[PDB]
Ligand SMILES: *[C@@H]1O[C@H](CO)[C@@H](O[C@@H]2O[C@H](CO)[C@@H](O[C@@H]3O[C@H](CO)[C@@H](O)[C@H](O)[C@@H]3O)[C@H](O)[C@H]2NC(C)=O)[C@H](O)[C@H]1NC(C)=O
Ligand SMILES: *[C@@H]1O[C@H](CO)[C@@H](O[C@@H]2O[C@H](CO)[C@@H](O[C@@H]3O[C@H](CO)[C@@H](O)[C@H](O)[C@@H]3O)[C@H](O)[C@H]2NC(C)=O)[C@H](O)[C@H]1NC(C)=O
Ligand SMILES: *[C@@H]1O[C@H](CO)[C@@H](O)[C@H](O)[C@H]1NC(C)=O
């Protein structure tokens with residue numbers, strides 16, 4: 125979703141993330157992990173993270189099956205960088 | 215190529231395997247073109263463009279690998295590079311260079327297009343067709359009349375045709391310039407089209423051979439090869 | 451003040467249709483060249499014997515209509531049809547400009 129605190133059109137505007145290649149058969153094996161924390165008065169040091177974990181292979185177009193992003197969910201970056209173990213949950 | 219003793223052989227595998235994270239498995243040349251300032255190599259593990267050729271810095275070509283989302287190894291083995299061989303010696307300000315790449319694909323949820331073209335710094339590859347469907351065998355940019363020529367052939371039918379569309383701010387448009395020219399139903403399979411270098415002649419080839427003067431509104435058959443197709447062309 | 455009537459010209463050649471032939475002729479640089487010759491009258495007691503030529507070049511023009519394509523459609527070539535006082539017979543010779 126775009127944001128929830130700024131209603132403009134009385135209809136949720138949803139933006140679709142970019143994942144290169146992942147097709148339908150990789151979205152059916154996928155989980156969203158989120159730490160349930162209540163930020164009521166919203167201190168400046170508190171941020172929100174979401175992780176997505178996929179059950180796919182390792183193409184020439186990707187390499188990772190684990191991504192995480194911060195409170196504006198636009199830049200999804202991989203959770204592990206540079207036989208290889210599989211990340212169930214980050 | 216007047217002597218086999220002077221053809222010097224180079225292996226470029228270290229430079230290629232640099233840009234590619236890990237190490238894959240079958241890096242053969244699939245196509246290569248040599249523009250007036252750039253070198254474009256399509257190999258089985260991707261498309262690479264040289265940085266520039268007029269500014270030596272390190273005495274080794276530095277190749278930058280293009281982005282294509284998803285296309286794997288089976289998409290690069292079936293891929294053609296089309297380029298118009300034109301000499302820009304004194305380099306007038308209106309002359310630019312284009313390159314087209316054509317694949318054979320299925321239309322994933324990650325792409326849609328199987329035909330891309332790009333201008334002289336070969337970094338921004340944008341699709342050649344925009345918003346059953348025909349398959350673009352060959353897209354060519356002609357600069358004499360400032361237009362783009364598509365060779366379409368709908369699958370599951372023998373229909374083959376050519377469409378010329380005007381170019382708006384360096385991007386081809388809908389609404390063709392003049393109504394399209396439909397080839398006869400005997401045209402079994404086309405394989406591409408070529409501009410003769412430094413000229414305005416068009417040549418469609420495949421199971422048959424057709425030539426067009428002017429832009430490509432009217433063609434005239436010059437050869438028929440029943441169940442036989444030309445594979446490559448050389449001209450001077 | 452203008453003459454009435456124009457001369458409208460195209461060409462036809464077997465195996466192809468007229469409109470794409472005219473489009474190709476325009477796109478390759480061709481332009482018709484027209485030569486008009488006037489014949490004098492029998493009455494030389496009322497008009498003089500002089501014989502006149504006029505050489506013109508036909509101007510391309512588009513046919514107004516639906517025109518599905520962006521630029522070009524049905525296309526024709528046009529020239530004025532001039533007549534002088536003293537004659538009823540004119541010969542119009544059409545030929546090509548070489549291109
Ligand atoms: C090339 O020029 C020729 C003549 O200079 C054009 O042929 C003419 O085309 C018109 C179509 O508008 C024909 O008119 C038709 O006449 C019949 C009977 O009068 C009428 O029932 C139709 O509704 C229509 O009005 C005309 O007969 C025809 N003339 C000849 C000698 O064939 C031709 O159209 C031009 N080509 C292009 C591409 O413009
Ligand atoms: C055949 O010969 C006749 C006789 O000269 C030509 O007709 C004459 O043409 C002139 C100029 O076009 C006319 O003069 C104008 O007349 C109008 C109408 O009154 C007036 O408002 C203008 O200020 C000007 O004076 C003249 O009237 C006309 N003669 C007649 C009897 O109407 C004719 O042009 C010749 N044929 C050809 C093909 O040139
Ligand atoms: C890789 O593909 C194989 C089958 O081709 C499949 O068993 C496996 O799940 C894929 N990789 C992983 C660990 O997800």
Ligand SMILES: *[C@@H]1O[C@H](CO)[C@@H](O)[C@H](O)[C@H]1NC(C)=O
Nearest residue numbers: 292317318319320321328349
């Ligand atoms: C499209 O997919 C079909 C089967 O899904 C395959 O047989 C065909 O080869 C693909 N098209 C191309 C151009 O490879």
